[PDB]
Design a protein around this nucleic acid. Structure first.
Ligand SMILES: [Zn+2]
Ligand SMILES: [Zn+2]
Ligand SMILES: [Zn+2]
Ligand SMILES: [Zn+2]
Lengths: 194, 194, 194, 194
DNA sequence: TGCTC
DNA sequence: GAGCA
DNA sequence: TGCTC
DNA sequence: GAGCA
DNA sequence: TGCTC
DNA sequence: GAGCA
DNA sequence: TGCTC
DNA sequence: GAGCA
């Protein structure tokens, strides 16, 4: 439910600023919110202080932030669902896609009907303290008939081979045309109270 | 094709300004463009200088203004097509609907596949120089996957009972959230050259 | 072969300047050259001083301007030929497409193998001195493996129902990213001699 | 994945500057990027501090540098793939070719479909600290329908006879018309921050 | 002479 | 449309 | 150029 | 309708 | 960023 | 390699 | 808050 | 990225 590092010290990390990728993907620490452009790869870092057990997996799911929409399943808008921008793996209705993995599992929960994408947990490269997974959002937050300007939260969860929760972290996400511009807007607004 | 008053002096007239209906529907003479809000009734006046022959009809059709999109059929966006805002007569994909008539004909041309709505031609009320038909546009000009910010033209045509063209007139239309504001914008822009 | 107005006073006319369409399509009178962007509709005007005989047609063909390449058939480059930007009528290898006509004939000459597109000749609308046909070029002049920076000429020909030549006119064409910029470049260069 | 010298101290070395070959092939140390011309032989040096086991091989593969294109297989553009500039060994679609070896293996991975070229590992000549392999790139980085201006990375890997990874190094590559000019451009840009 | 901002 | 590619 | 107050 | 999105 | 002189 | 494309 | 220049 | 939408 809430952030939970668990026994493996699991938590998320984000790309450093001033890199050019900032144009299509920029993270705001004070807001713990990611600003990105539709269909652009977003590098998310996975940090663990202990090696997860064999067969551990990483799930990504999107939920609406406000309790007023909490129960509504987050899916692509009717327009993009038909856009035919498929990669041959992600179903057309899924908002979140993983990039760089030829064997992701795209699921729909039998009871909640929520979408999620699962990928095997991979340890960091030699000399690295974290592992990077690339995600892509296939609709803008303002998409009519879709998120329709409702903020969402991306929930990342580390699970063992049997599905048991090992760790969980999350961040807000805004998919828009100008991440840089919009990020500044929400940051100076927030700063107005500091 | 182009404006054609024909033998009956057929042409369109629009609502006078300063009426309150101006908020949801306001016409710009200099631009010969109608600014209106989605699903709001727009009164269009039909003027003839001679009584049309028995069984004459009035057709309304939407086409894209620019030759770059001219051939593309104008239809509602994927979102509104599923909105379930039907009146029980207009098919869900039609942009233009007639209001106030219990027997309109909603058609799709066999060759062009363009939509149109036909209503019997009605003469003016006693002491009136024109007849008023009420139209409604079921998508905003900016609708994604629909008109997607492409300006359109509404073509009104007077035809006899056999479908022969008697007269034809047209006007530009912009379906938006703030007709008044947007109309001012395009008018002062245009005025910049006067 | 060369310009030939014939008995019908046939010749071409081009869009007036200062219209916005100028961004994607602008004609240079001094150069008798059209500057346009790939896949953008270009309005070409057909002028006749006498009504062509019944069943007359209008053909458009592209040839290389320089005698060094004159014999080479003008076709799309290998990349765009596979782009899948078809309209369902124009074969993928044809450079020139007609827009706004549901019944064009796309041909390949049995001996020269040159492409051309034929459309029925249509008279001007009432009160108009010319008829407008919309053409589109599906490759840039600089396309590698295609025109590869070799200037071409578009040949427009008025033919009767039997294929006999009634009239013929032509103009140079440059398909590029910035018609306005490039047109200025070739015009001030040419003006350098005036 | 990342650079890995392994137990044999494997790493790459590049041609010294001021040699004339610099015109068609010049390496930028600060950028660890190679600037070269299409189809020109590029000498790459292989350095090991210990003799690789018998039957060791050297593989070269091209991948896109940005995660946004990471998954896309790097191949020649549609035009050059048909150019018929084959050497009788390298398949027409492969970007990278080895020069000077009559027995190279050109492969396509069964799962990723990525191309690579393998050659037997050869030790340095007597009195030499490194072995030189000659590679050639068969498309420009700007090739339309190909790399289309997307930077790539050439991955060199030392493997034993069974395919096990022994070492791996990499460098960026830009295939262009003027390596010298372009290299200066990216270097003074980078220097602007030093 | 095409592409990014 | 300007600046860079 | 649409949405919240 | 104004201000923000 | 590729091509002509 | 410079200048133009 | 997305799109054109 | 700026200005307009
Ligand atoms: Zn969407
Ligand atoms: Zn709509
Ligand atoms: Zn092309
Ligand atoms: Zn190529």
């Amino acid at each position: 439910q809430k952030t939970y590092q668990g026994n493996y010290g699991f938590h998320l990390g984000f790309l450093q600023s001033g890199t050019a990728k900032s144009v299509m993907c920029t993270y705001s620490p004070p807001l713990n919110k990611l600003f990105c452009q539709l269909a652009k790869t977003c590098p998310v870092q996975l940090w663990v202080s202990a090696t997860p057990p064999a067969g551990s997996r990483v799930r990504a799911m999107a939920i609406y932030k406000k309790s007023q929409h909490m129960t509504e399943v987050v899916r692509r808008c009717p327009h993009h669902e038909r856009c035919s921008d498929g990669d041959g793996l992600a179903p057309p209705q899924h908002l979140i896609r993983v990039e760089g993995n030829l064997y992701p599992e795209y699921l729909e929960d039998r009871q909640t009907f929520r979408h999620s994408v699962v990928v095997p947990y991979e340890p960091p490269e030699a000399g690295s303290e974290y592992t990077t997974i690339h995600y892509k959002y296939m609709c803008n937050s303002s998409c009519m008939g879709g998120m329709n300007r409702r903020p969402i939260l991306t929930i990342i969860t580390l699970e063992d081979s049997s599905g048991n929760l090992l760790g969980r972290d999350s961040f807000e996400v805004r998919v828009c045309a100008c991440p840089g511009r919009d990020r500044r807007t929400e940051e100076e607004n927030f700063r107005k109270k500091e």
